[PDB]
A paper describes a structure:
Here, we present structural studies on one of these proteins, H. pylori biotin protein ligase (HpBPL), which catalyzes the transfer of biotin to biotin-accepting proteins. HpBPL is required for essential metabolic pathways, including fatty-acid synthesis, gluconeogenesis and amino-acid catabolism. HpBPL catalyzes the activation of various biotin-dependent metabolic pathways, including fatty-acid synthesis, gluconeogenesis and amino-acid catabolism, and may facilitate the survival of H. pylori in the high-pH gastric mucosa. ENDScript analysis reveals that HpBPL has a prototypical bacterial biotin protein ligase topology.
Here, we report the production, crystallization and 2.25 Å resolution structure of HpBPL. The pyrophosphate group from biotinyl-5-ATP in our HpBPL structure forms hydrogen bonds with the three catalytic site residues (Arg46, Lys99 and His182). Overall, HpBPL shares significant structural similarities with MtBPL, which is promising for repurposing MtBPL inhibitors.
Numbering used by the authors: 3 to 211
The structure:
């Protein structure tokens, strides 16, 4: 498998990895783990807060490492769904709320973030393990076990077509919830319908993230 670097603390594994690729100091595939993040990044430049114990890493892939039929807009959905299936095989009840959120019950415990740079895809995943502020993962699997499973699910190289069909079975759970559009405004998923490229339509309007 691919090299892993583990830091006790970084501002952000995503920022670290992106800047190393931009400077041509690393090459995909490579995996970057921070035991603690001090300036984690969510979606839309929101903060992803560090908990007492959290799983936070970023994984750089080459396009060739992903299905040929995977649209760029579906990156977070595809990698997020595989991560969730890794969690489910380890006994977790975690589910994927559209577009890229890891939920337990009806509370967010983690999220997926994909940045694209020169055809390389930088997948950043955070999941709370221990915290008094936020909900946490419902299993005890080591971080190494979760990440190894993740690398293997990616390695199975399933068509995007297959993965979305699995997710389409559970999209409906998202209908009770909402997401933030590009301008930060809450939008209900009640009437949202899934599209074959991972986007949704709500009464004739298409959304992505
Ligand atoms: N610890 C916490 N637990 C629960 N909730 C928390 C929280 N900290 C803040 N919150 C609240 O969660 C909202 C903001 O999260 P978010 O913008 O993005 C994401 O999930 C992407 C996460 C990817 C991080 C990984 S870590 C390893 C890489 N390096 C790093 O730098 N990036 C990646 O999603 P969102 O809330 O806007 O919801 P919708 O998708 O439904 O619109 C907001 O509420 C906030 O208070």
């Amino acid at each position: 498998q691919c090299e892993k670097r583990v830091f006790d603390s970084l501002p952000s594994t995503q920022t670290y990895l992106l800047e190393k690729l931009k400077n041509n100091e690393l090459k995909a595939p490579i995996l970057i783990v921070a035991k603690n993040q001090s300036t984690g990044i969510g979606s839309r430049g929101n903060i992803w807060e560090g908990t007492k114990s959290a799983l936070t890493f970023s994984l750089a892939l080459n396009a060739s490492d992903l299905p040929k039929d995977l649209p760029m807009q579906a990156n977070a959905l595809y990698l997020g769904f595989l991560f969730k299936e890794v969690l489910k095989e380890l006994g977790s009840q975690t589910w994927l709320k559209w577009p890229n959120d890891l939920y337990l019950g009806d509370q967010k415990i983690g999220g997926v973030l994909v940045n694209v740079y020169k055809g390389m895809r930088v997948c950043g995943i955070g999941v709370n393990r221990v915290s008094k502020k936020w909900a946490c993962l419902d299993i005890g699997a080591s971080d190494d076990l979760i990440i190894e499973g993740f690398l293997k699910k990616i390695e199975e190289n399933l068509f995007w077509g297959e993965v979305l069909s699995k997710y389409a079975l559970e999209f409906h759970r998202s209908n009770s919830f909402s997401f933030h559009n590009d301008w930060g405004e809450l939008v209900s998923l009640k009437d949202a319908e899934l599209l074959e490229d991972g986007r949704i339509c709500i009464k004739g309007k298409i959304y992505d993230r």
